[PDB]
């Protein structure tokens, strides 16, 4: 009977817009619960409403500052919106709340590579946390050296 439980039913059946109605009704009847906005952000993702999904995730994060799944959904949403550096900061937060989260490790590689491809070297090299994973030191390949800063 819970408006969230009723919304989850439509969600399993792939009826995404009808689950949002239930999630909206559940939000307007319980603004403190962080499950409802995160659930509605997940349904927004299923219909490529990435802008609307980011706000629903931030609302959930404000309510619960440790909601790992909320950072995850905002991370994918921010990638589709192009906010790569902001997406990287979310998935690295997940990696702190859930060390070894496989979705986080995968999406972090895919993001940190596209950031370097676009030239945002400092966003990767300066904000890096894994600097302690030291690595102590056949045709060759000439790699051109662009500039930055």
């Amino acid at each position: 009977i819970s408006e969230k439980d009723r919304g989850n039913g439509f969600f399993k059946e792939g009826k995404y817009e009808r689950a949002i109605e239930c999630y909206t009704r559940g939000i307007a009847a319980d603004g403190a619960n962080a499950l409802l906005p995160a659930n509605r952000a997940m349904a927004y993702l299923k219909i490529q409403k990435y802008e609307e999904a980011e706000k629903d995730c931030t609302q959930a994060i404000l309510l619960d500052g440790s909601y790992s799944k909320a950072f995850a959904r905002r991370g994918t949403a921010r990638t589709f919106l192009g906010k790569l550096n902001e997406a990287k900061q979310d998935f690295e937060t997940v990696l702190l709340l859930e060390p070894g989260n496989k979705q986080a490790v995968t999406e972090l590689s895919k993001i940190k590579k596209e950031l370097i491809e676009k030239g945002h070297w400092d966003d990767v090299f300066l904000d890096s946390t894994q600097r302690q994973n030291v690595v102590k030191p056949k045709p060759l390949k000439k790699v051109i050296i662009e500039e930055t800063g």
């Binding site: 491809e117 070297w121 990767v124 030191p137 045709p139 662009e146």
Partner: protein, 86 residues
């Protein structure tokens, strides 16, 4: 006299991403600087600096990129790793 071996920083930013940081203070500008990356080797070559290092990891040379930071006088390398054997 001769070319000096610079200071190198290596770490795993990701399981399949290896990052490098070479300090080149006496150097300025990417012009006249060459970088060669093999499967297990890193060659940085004007003859002010020279660095011939061996890396214990499988480097994807084709998809590797580099950049000389002018403010910090550093050469930054991004070396994606090749898929490991099953």
């Amino acid at each position: 006299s001769g070319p000096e071996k610079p200071h190198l920083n290596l770490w795993l930013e990701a399981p399949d991403l290896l990052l490098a940081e070479v300090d080149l203070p006496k150097l300025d500008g990417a012009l006249g600087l060459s970088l060669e990356i093999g499967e297990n080797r890193l060659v940085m070559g004007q003859q002010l600096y020279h660095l011939d290092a061996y890396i214990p990891l499988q480097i994807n040379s084709h998809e590797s990129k580099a950049a000389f930071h002018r403010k910090r006088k550093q050469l930054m390398v991004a070396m994606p790793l090749l898929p490991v054997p099953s």
